[PDB]
Amino acid sequence: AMQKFIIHKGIACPLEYANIDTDQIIPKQFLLAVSKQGFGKHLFHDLRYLDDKESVLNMDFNLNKKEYQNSSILVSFENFGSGSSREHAPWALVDYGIRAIIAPSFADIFKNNALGNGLLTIELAKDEVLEIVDELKKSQDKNIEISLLEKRVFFKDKIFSFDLDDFHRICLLEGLDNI
C-alpha cells in the first residue's frame, strides 16, 4: 500500500539505538494477518509502554515526549529494521504517521518493504546522522524538511544529500504500488 512522497516537512524524533529490530518495531503478538484498525498503537511497544495494556507511557522514550508529538520523521542509528521479513514493521511505522527514516544504514529486507509501503528510507553518512541527532535534541524546533525530487534533507540551514534507486523513487513520487 503506497502513498506519494514528493516533499515532506514534519516533526523529527531521534532514537539513539542501533540495530532497532523488527520485534522492537512491532512485537509478534500483534502480527494479525488482517486487521481493521492498523498497527500504529503497537509501534515500539516494548520501548513505549511500561505496562502490558498499552496504557502507561515510558516517558524516557522520546516519541512519548511533548516535544516529539506528531512525529513523522525518525532519526536512528545503523542497521535499522534488522531481522527477517516482517511486513507489519513498515505498516506500524506508517500507521503511526512516520513518513521517512534517516539512518546510516537499513537492514536490506526492511528497506525494500518500507519503500514498498511508501516509507522513505534515507541513508546518510554516520557523521551526518550524529550531527542531526545532536542538533535535533538541542533544538526547540523539531521540523526537518525532505525533498525526494532533489534527494535532499533540510534541517535548519544544513543540507544533506541521499541516494535512492530510480524505480523506488519514481514509485514514491507518483504513489505507484509496484514494489
Q: Was domain 1-179 assigned CATH 3.20.19.10?
A: yes
Confirm if 49 and 56 have CB atoms less than 8 A apart: yes
Q: Which three cell numbers stand for residue 58?
A: 515510558
Q: Is 82 exposed, middle or buried (0-12, 13-18, 19+ CB in 10 A)?
A: buried
> What counts of helices (H) and strands (E) characterise the chain?
6, 7
Confirm if 133 and 144 have CB atoms less than 8 A apart: no
Residue 19, Ramachandran bin (φ over 0: left; ψ between -120 and 50: alpha; else beta)? left
Resolution in angstroms for this experimental structure?
Answer: 1.9
Q: Which three cell numbers stand for residue 98?
A: 512516520
Beta strands 143-147 and 7-15 are antiparallel
**Domain assignments of the chain as residue spans, ordered by start:** 1-179
Please name the method used to determine this structure: X-ray
